[PDB]
C-alpha cells in the first residue's frame, strides 16, 4: 500500500546534525579509491557509493552521515538528501541486525510467497514493518529481486535464500538467532537456476578455445 516512511526530517536527540559520525581511516582509503574511478571535475558521481559506504559502517544513515558525505564530496547537502530519500536501499532509520526482505511481486507471489511471509511473522512475532524487541530482525516486503525462478525467495543482508518453504525460512531464522550464518542459495537441492530435475540442456562438455572460429582470424 502506502509507503509509511516520512520524507521530511525532524531532529531527535538520537538523530540530529550533532549526532557523532565519522568514517574510519580504512573507510577514508576506500573513499579515495571510489573517488578516483570518476573523471576529474565530476566528483559527485561518488555520492551513491560513498553514502552506501557510510551505511555499511554505521548500519543506517543519520542526518550527520549525509552532512559528512556532502562535506567530503563538496556537494550541497540537499543533493545528498535527494539521493538518500530516492533510493530504497538507504536506511534513514535504524534497522535490526538482520534485515529480512521477502519478495511479493507476481512471479514470486504465484509460488506462495504469502506462506513465507506468514511463517516469518509467526516465527518472529512481528509485522511487515516492525523490528523485533531484541533489535535483531526487521521484516519488510520488497518488489522483484531478480530471483524469480527461485521464488519464493528472501534477501538478508546481501544473501539470497531461495526456493523457500515455511520450514526452511523458520530454520534459517533459527540458525541466524543462535549465532551462526546460513549458506545462501536454493533450499531444495538445486543450488542453481537449473530445472528441478533432469538438466534439460548443458549436459555435454563445453567446446574448447577456437572450436567455432571463422576463417581469416
Amino acid at each position: 500500500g502506502a509507503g509509511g516512511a516520512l520524507f521530511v526530517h525532524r531532529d531527535t536527540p538520537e538523530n540530529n546534525p550533532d549526532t557523532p559520525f565519522d568514517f574510519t581511516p580504512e573507510n577514508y582509503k576506500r573513499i579515495e579509491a571510489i573517488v578516483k574511478n570518476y573523471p576529474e571535475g565530476h566528483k559527485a558521481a561518488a555520492v551513491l557509493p560513498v553514502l552506501d559506504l557510510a551505511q555499511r559502517q554505521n548500519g543506517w544513515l543519520p542526518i550527520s552521515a549525509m552532512n559528512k558525505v556532502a562535506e567530503i564530496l563538496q556537494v550541497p547537502p540537499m543533493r545528498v538528501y535527494e539521493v538518500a530519500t530516492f533510493y530504497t536501499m538507504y536506511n534513514r532509520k535504524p534497522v535490526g541486525k538482520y534485515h529480512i526482505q521477502v519478495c511479493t511481486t507476481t512471479p514470486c507471489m504465484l509460488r506462495n510467497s504469502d506462506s513465507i511471509l506468514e511463517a516469518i511473522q509467526k516465527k518472529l512475532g512481528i509485522k511487515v514493518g516492525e523490528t523485533t524487541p531484541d533489535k535483531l530482525f526487521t521484516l519488510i516486503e520488497v518488489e522483484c529481486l531478480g530471483a524469480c525462478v527461485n521464488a519464493p525467495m528472501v534477501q538478508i543482508n546481501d544473501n539470497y535464500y531461495e526456493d523457500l518453504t515455511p520450514k526452511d525460512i523458520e530454520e534459517i531464522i533459527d540458525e541466524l538467532k543462535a549465532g551462526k550464518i546460513p549458506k545462501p542459495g536454493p533450499r531444495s537441492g538445486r543450488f542453481s537456476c537449473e530445472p528441478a530435475g533432469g538438466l534439460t540442456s548443458l549436459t555435454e562438455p563445453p567446446k574448447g578455445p577456437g572450436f567455432g572460429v571463422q576463417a581469416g582470424l
Partner: protein
C-alpha cells in the same frame, strides 16, 4: 570432467567490505582519469 558440482562458493565467504576492498585493489591498474578542466561544475 563433472557437471554435478556447483563450484560457485566464493560468495559464501564474502564480507561487507569485499566489494570495496576489491575496488581499492583495482585502483592500482587504472589508467589516469580524464579531466573536464574544472574542480566542479560550480568552479
Amino acid at each position: 570432467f563433472d557437471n554435478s558440482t556447483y563450484r560457485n562458493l566464493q560468495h559464501h565467504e564474502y564480507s561487507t567490505y569485499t566489494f570495496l576492498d576489491l575496488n581499492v585493489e583495482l585502483s592500482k591498474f587504472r589508467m589516469p582519469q580524464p579531466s573536464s578542466g574544472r574542480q566542479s561544475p560550480r568552479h
